[model samples]
Target: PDPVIPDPPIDPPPGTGKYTCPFAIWSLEEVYEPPTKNRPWPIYNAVELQPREFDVALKDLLGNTKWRDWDSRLSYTTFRGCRGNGYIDLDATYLATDQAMRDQKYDIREGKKPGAFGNIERFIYLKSINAYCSLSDIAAYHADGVIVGFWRDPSSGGAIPFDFTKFDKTKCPIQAVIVVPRA
Candidate 1:
């Protein structure tokens, strides 16, 4: 018999649970006030975040919990099967130590073309902005700083640390290496 994986628990306790959005970077000015078009959304890091606070802020910015695009942006984890109200059921963990991240193996280069072949690249593919705000549209869009979230790997049960130096980042259109201070 195949081992079956059950769906995520319903109505899990709040504060801290399976999912976590640990840290985000931003322009110092943006941190003190609401995001705006003029605000230069710069990189920031290492500061801790509360889940409820993040939920409300993202809700306010996106006008809903539904994500925008999954391609190039700045988030550590992506949420699926949102509760349909406001809260979410997260399933990724980034709390793993650097050693744990390296121990695991996964595909890094994904494409149909050759020259991209390798010995199964281990680098993780991450980018940002899963919100409703459109970066292409400067008119109604506001300037929200770069956001990063970490997740627990369901397969290996290891913390997925964010490393800027490693992996191929040329695929990211607008990108910067933001240092995350230790928690």
Candidate 2:
């Protein structure tokens, strides 16, 4: 389906009972106010976010031990079920972290698609967004970004943490908002 145009796009239908959009593209400018963009949006690790505000909460939410642990985990946890009213394409962002991102030599020669980056873009996306739709499901369509959601195939699971219980049918196309990396 298409992104139902609700003029000025209203907020997502109250997300599931246990999720929230901790980091979203729509609010970046309000927080960071530094990383300029053609269009402003929410930013991850904003100056205003303050270390105390989220650092402790992150430790409790992710059960992490240190900043490195949290940072590492944040940069590599992509789960479809944790989507919101939008989609974020992280391919370029993913490959960039490879250090040797532009070096075709390592792209295939080293047998490393993500190269030294380790295909952690998806996880990084989660960390970057920081917002999790507790009670929603987002679909990609009609521009808003890439649709990254979940489906219960009952046969396997990806390498990240996901909560399928919050999946919703009505809000399949959870509004869309794009956030280009390093924007």
Candidate 3:
């Protein structure tokens, strides 16, 4: 039998403000590998997103507990293009890890890595709109920096970790979103 998934909370918890969603949107660009095999450059492709679209995607990815917790704390909303939310950014370069390690972590999260930690660390080096604010601060729209790694597969419900050292634009195209605070 298929397991039941409960509905996530749409509004902020009691005592929270009406506009306290604690999430914002920041768009990312498409990366292209140079023909000369040098570093890749951003193409500045504006990704269009709506608040309602992200709301639904978040509910689908997280359980009730996670969703409620996320609502309370400031978190960056991540997405790949218009593919919808449920994506996460991992910086292989900044994290000093490789695809193998990234995949291992993903396996652990998916319950496939044997004798591994139960939970994957939820933190990464994210580019912030303001350098002074915290990575998850609502005051600044958290921007995902360069360096590719694992991203949640919107279609299959898994993750894809790419090689940042040798990034192939065609093979691994990544697009991330920034979170802007509610007005």
Candidate 4:
């Protein structure tokens, strides 16, 4: 059976404003259990709604003088059910260009402070409900040289956590975008 989809949050966390731009939409599917008990493991599948492209404009910011039209891949895997907890991973070949840019590093930090160049922040915005359920609560750089983030369903529940049965691809699609700033 598919999991239950949680309702969108009424208000987005502070610092995260309306993201008005062309972004990529993706989905993370979770298989609760295998058919046989011998292999009792959950499977996760990441699907992209369309091609991933980002036109990064770093004009004058952080002493950057060039623009990049690059392609990037974003995927996620869920660990726990109902609670909606998972880790997000991103991979891009072109981001490794330039010595100064490649040397940049990012780690999880508090508030809206900008740090490293490759730092990433993720937010969950549902267009159907016009609400954001999650924010940049846990965003950082992985030691493997990829931008990673963590997310949890921002809904209150009883003793048993909420269940995400299915996702609304049309109205509640997962979107991601890229922006550059000199930190």
Provide the clashing-pair count of each candidate structure: 14, 23, 6, 7
| Cα lDDT, model 1, residue 53 | 23
- Residue 148 error, candidate 4, Å: 13
The number of clashing residue pairs in model 1 is: 14
**Index of the highest-lDDT prediction:** 4
lDDT of 2 by residue, 33-112 (tens): 33245323223321122211122111112211111111122243432222322321222222223332233211211111
lDDT of 1: 0.24
Prediction RMSDs, each to the true structure: 18.6, 16.5, 16.2, 17.8
Runs off by more than 4 Å, candidate 4: 1-17, 20-24, 30-41, 51-180
lDDT of candidate 1 over 1-183, digit per residue (tens): 998985432221232212222323211112223324643222211121232123222222222244222322224444332222322111112112233233323212111111335111112222332211111111112222232222222333332223432211221111111122211
What lDDT would candidate 2 get against the real structure? Answer: 0.24
Model 1 bad stretches (over 4 Å): 4-131, 134-144, 150-152, 161-183
The segments of candidate 2 whose C-alpha lies over 4 angstroms from its true place after superposition are 1-14, 20-46, 50-183
Residue 140 CA displacement from its true place in model 2, Å: 23
Which 10 consecutive residues of model 4 have the lowest summed lDDT? 104-113
- What TM-score does prediction 2 earn? 0.18
The TM-score, computed over Cα atoms with residue i paired to residue i, of candidate 4 is 0.21
By the lDDT metric, which is better: model 3 or model 4? 4
The CA lDDT at 2 in model 2 is: 95
Residue pairs with backbone atoms closer than 3 Å in model 4 (clashes): 3-164, 3-165, 4-163, 4-164, 4-165, 5-165, 62-182
Number of backbone clashes in candidate 3: 6
